[PDB]
PDB file of C-alpha atoms and ligand atoms in Angstrom:
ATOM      1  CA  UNK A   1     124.819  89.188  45.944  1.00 30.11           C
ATOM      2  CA  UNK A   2     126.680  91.975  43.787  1.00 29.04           C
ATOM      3  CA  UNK A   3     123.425  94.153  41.918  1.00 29.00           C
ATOM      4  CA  UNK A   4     124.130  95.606  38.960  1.00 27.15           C
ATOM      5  CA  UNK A   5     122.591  99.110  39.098  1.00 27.52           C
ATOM      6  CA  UNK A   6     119.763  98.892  37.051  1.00 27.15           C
ATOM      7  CA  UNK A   7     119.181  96.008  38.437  1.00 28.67           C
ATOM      8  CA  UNK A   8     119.313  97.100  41.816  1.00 27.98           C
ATOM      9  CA  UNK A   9     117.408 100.301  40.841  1.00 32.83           C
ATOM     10  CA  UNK A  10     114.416  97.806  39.001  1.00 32.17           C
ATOM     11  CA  UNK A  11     114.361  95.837  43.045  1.00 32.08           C
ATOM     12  CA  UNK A  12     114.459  99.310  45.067  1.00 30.32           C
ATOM     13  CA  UNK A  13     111.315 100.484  42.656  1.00 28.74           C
ATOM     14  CA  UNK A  14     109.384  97.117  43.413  1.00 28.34           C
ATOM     15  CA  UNK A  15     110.097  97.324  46.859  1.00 26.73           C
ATOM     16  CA  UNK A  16     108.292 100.910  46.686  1.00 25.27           C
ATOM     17  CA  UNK A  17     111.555 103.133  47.538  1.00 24.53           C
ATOM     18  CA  UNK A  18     110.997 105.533  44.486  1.00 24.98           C
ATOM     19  CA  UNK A  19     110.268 108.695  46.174  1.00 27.77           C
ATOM     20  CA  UNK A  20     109.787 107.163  48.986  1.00 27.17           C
ATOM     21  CA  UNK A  21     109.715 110.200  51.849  1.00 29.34           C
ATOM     22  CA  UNK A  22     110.298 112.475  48.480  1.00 29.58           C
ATOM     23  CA  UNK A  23     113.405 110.573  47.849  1.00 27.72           C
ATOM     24  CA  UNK A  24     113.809 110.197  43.956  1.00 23.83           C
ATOM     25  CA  UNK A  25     114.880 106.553  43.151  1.00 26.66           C
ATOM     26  CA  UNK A  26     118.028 107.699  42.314  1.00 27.60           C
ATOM     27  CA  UNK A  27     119.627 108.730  45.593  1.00 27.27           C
ATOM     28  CA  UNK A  28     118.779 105.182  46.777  1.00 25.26           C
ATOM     29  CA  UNK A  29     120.916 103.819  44.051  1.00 25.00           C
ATOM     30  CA  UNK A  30     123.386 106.607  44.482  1.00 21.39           C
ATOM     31  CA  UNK A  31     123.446 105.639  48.383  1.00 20.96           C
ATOM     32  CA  UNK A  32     123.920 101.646  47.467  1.00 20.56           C
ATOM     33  CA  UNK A  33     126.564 102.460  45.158  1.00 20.47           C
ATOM     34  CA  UNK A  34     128.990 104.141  47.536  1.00 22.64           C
ATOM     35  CA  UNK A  35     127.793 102.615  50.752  1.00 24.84           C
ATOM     36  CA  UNK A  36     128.458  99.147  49.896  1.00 24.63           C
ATOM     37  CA  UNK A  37     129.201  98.903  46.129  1.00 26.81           C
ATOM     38  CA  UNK A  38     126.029  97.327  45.747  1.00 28.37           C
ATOM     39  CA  UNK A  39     127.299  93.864  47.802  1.00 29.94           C
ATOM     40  CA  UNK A  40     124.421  92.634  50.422  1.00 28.76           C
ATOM     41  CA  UNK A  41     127.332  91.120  51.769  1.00 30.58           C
ATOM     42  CA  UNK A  42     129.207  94.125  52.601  1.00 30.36           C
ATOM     43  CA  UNK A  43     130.084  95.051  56.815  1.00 26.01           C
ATOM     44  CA  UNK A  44     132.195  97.311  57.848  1.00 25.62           C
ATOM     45  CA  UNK A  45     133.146  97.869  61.589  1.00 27.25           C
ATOM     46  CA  UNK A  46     133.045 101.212  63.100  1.00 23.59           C
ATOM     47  CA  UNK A  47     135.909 102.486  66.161  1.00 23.22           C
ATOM     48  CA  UNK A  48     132.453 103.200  68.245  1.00 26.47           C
ATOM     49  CA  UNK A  49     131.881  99.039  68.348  1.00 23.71           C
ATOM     50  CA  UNK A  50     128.903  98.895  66.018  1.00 21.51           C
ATOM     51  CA  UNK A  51     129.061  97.512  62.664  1.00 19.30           C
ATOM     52  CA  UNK A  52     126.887  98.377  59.222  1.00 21.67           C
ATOM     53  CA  UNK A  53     125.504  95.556  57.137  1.00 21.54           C
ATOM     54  CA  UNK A  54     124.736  95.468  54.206  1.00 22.93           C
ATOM     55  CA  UNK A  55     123.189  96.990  50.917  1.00 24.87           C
ATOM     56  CA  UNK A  56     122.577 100.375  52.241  1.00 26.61           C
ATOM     57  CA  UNK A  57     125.260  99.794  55.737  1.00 23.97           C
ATOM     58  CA  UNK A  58     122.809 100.019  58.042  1.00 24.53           C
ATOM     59  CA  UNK A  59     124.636 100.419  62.111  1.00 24.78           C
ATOM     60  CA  UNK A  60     124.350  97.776  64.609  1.00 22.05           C
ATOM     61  CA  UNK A  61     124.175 100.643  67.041  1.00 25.12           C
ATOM     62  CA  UNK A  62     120.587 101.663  66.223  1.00 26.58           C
ATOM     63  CA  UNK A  63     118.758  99.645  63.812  1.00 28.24           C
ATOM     64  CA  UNK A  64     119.735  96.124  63.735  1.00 29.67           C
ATOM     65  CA  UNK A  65     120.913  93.098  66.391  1.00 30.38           C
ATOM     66  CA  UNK A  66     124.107  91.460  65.719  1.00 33.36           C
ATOM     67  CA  UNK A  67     124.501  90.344  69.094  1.00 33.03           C
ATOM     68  CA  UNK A  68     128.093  92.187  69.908  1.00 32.79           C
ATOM     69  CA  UNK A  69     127.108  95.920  69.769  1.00 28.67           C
ATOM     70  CA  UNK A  70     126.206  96.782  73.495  1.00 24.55           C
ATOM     71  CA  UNK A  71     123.056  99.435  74.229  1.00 26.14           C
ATOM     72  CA  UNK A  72     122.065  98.758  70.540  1.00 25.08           C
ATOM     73  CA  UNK A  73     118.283  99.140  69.848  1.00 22.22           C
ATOM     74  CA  UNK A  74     117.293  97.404  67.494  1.00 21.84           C
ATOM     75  CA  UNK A  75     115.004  99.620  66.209  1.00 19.21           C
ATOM     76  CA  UNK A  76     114.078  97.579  62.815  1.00 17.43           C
ATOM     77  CA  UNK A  77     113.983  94.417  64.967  1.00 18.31           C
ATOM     78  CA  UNK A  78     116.303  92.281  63.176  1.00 19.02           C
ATOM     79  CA  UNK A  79     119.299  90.419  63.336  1.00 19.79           C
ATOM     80  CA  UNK A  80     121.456  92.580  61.398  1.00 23.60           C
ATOM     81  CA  UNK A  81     122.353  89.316  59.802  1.00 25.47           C
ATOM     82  CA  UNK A  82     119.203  89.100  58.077  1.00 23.58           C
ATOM     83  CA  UNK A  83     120.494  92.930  55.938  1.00 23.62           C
ATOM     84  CA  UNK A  84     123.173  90.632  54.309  1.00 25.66           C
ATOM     85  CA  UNK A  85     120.650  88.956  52.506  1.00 23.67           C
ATOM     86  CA  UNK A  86     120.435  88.769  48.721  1.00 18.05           C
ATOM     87  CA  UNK A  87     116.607  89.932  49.178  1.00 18.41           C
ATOM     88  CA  UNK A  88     116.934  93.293  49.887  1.00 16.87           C
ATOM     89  CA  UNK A  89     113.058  93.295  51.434  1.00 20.27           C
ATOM     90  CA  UNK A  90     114.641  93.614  55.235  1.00 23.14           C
ATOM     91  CA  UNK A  91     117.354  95.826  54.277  1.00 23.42           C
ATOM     92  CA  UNK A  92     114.675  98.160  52.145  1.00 25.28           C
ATOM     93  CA  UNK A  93     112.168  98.343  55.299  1.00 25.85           C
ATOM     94  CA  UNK A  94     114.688  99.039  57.537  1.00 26.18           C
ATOM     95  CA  UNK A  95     115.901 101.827  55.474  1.00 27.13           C
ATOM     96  CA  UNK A  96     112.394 102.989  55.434  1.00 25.14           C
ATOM     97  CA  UNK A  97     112.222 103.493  59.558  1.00 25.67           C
ATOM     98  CA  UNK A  98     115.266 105.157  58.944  1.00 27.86           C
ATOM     99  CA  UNK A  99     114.711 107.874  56.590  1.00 23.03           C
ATOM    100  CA  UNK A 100     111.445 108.464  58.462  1.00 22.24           C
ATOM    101  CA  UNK A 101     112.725 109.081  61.423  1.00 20.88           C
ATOM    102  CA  UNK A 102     113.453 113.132  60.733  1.00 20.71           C
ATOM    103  CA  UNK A 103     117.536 113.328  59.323  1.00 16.93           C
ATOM    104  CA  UNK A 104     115.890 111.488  56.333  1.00 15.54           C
ATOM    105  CA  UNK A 105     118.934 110.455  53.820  1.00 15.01           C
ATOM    106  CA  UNK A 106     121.289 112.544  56.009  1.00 12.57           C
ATOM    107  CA  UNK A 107     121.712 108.918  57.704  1.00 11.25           C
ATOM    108  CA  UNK A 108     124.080 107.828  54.915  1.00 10.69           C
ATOM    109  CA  UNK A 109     126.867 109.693  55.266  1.00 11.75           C
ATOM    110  CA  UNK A 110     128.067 108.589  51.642  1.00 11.22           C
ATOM    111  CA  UNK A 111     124.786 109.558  50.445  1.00 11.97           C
ATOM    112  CA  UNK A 112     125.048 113.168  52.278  1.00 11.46           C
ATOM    113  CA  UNK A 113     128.917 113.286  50.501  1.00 12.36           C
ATOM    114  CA  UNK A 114     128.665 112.013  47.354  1.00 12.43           C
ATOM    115  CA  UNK A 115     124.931 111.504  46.114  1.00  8.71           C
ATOM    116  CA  UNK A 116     123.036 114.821  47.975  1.00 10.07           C
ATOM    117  CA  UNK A 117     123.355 117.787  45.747  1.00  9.45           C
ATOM    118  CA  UNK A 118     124.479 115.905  42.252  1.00  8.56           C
ATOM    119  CA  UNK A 119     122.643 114.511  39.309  1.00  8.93           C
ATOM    120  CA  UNK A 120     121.015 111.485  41.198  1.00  7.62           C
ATOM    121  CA  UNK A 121     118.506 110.530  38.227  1.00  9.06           C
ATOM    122  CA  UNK A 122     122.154 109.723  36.395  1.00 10.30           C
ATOM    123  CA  UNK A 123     121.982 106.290  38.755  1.00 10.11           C
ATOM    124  CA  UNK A 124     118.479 105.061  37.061  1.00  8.83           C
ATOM    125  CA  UNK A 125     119.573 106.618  33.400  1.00  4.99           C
ATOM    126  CA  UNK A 126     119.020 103.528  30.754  1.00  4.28           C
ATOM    127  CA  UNK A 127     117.633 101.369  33.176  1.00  5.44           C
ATOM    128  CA  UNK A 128     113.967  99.636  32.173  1.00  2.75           C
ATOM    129  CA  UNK A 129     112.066 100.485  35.116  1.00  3.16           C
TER     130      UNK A 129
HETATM  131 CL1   CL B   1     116.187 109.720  40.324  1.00  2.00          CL
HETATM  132 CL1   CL B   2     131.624 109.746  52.441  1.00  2.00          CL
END
C-alpha cells in the first residue's frame, strides 16, 4: 500500500508513535517519506547481504527474519515479510524496539539526513489528526 501522508501520519498516531520516545509525530512521517516513499512494499538490498523492508526499511541484519541474511537476530521476531504489510502494526512495533534501543531515530539514516534538524511538524501540517 502507497499512504498518503496524512494518512499515514492519522495510522502512526493510532498506533501510539506521536512522541513516542520524545519523537514528535512528524519525524515518523518525515522518516516514511524518504525511507520508503511511504510504500509497505518497498525493499531495498544492502552490499552487507541484509535487506530493509518496508514502511520505515527496517534491516534484515538486526530486526527482522527473511530467511537469507546470515547471523541476523531477529530482534522484533518477525519474518521481515510480515513489515511489507499494508497494516503497519508490525512495522510500527518493530520501530518501537528500535528507537528504544539507545541511537533512537539515528537508526534511519534518511531520517538522521533529511528529517533531524528541519521543520518536522511540516509532515503532519493540514492533516486531521
Ligand atoms: Cl511533528
Ligand atoms: Cl540519506
Amino acid at each position: 500500500k502507497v499512504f498518503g501522508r496524512c494518512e499515514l501520519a492519522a495510522a502512526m498516531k493510532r498506533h501510539g508513535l506521536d512522541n513516542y520516545r520524545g519523537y514528535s509525530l512528524g519525524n515518523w512521517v518525515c522518516a516514511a517519506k524518504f525511507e520508503s516513499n511511504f510504500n509497505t512494499q518497498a525493499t531495498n538490498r544492502n552490499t552487507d547481504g541484509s535487506t530493509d523492508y518496508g514502511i520505515l526499511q527496517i534491516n534484515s541484519r538486526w530486526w527482522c527474519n527473511d530467511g537469507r541474511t546470515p547471523g541476523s537476530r531477529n530482534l522484533c521476531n518477525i519474518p521481515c515479510s510480515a513489515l511489507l504489510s499494508s497494516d503497519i502494526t508490525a512495522s510500527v512495533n518493530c520501530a518501537k524496539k528500535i528507537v528504544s534501543d539507545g541511537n533512537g531515530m539515528n537508526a534511519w539514516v534518511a531520517w538522521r539526513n533529511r528529517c533531524k534538524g528541519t521543520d518536522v511538524q511540516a509532515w503532519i501540517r493540514g492533516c486531521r489528526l
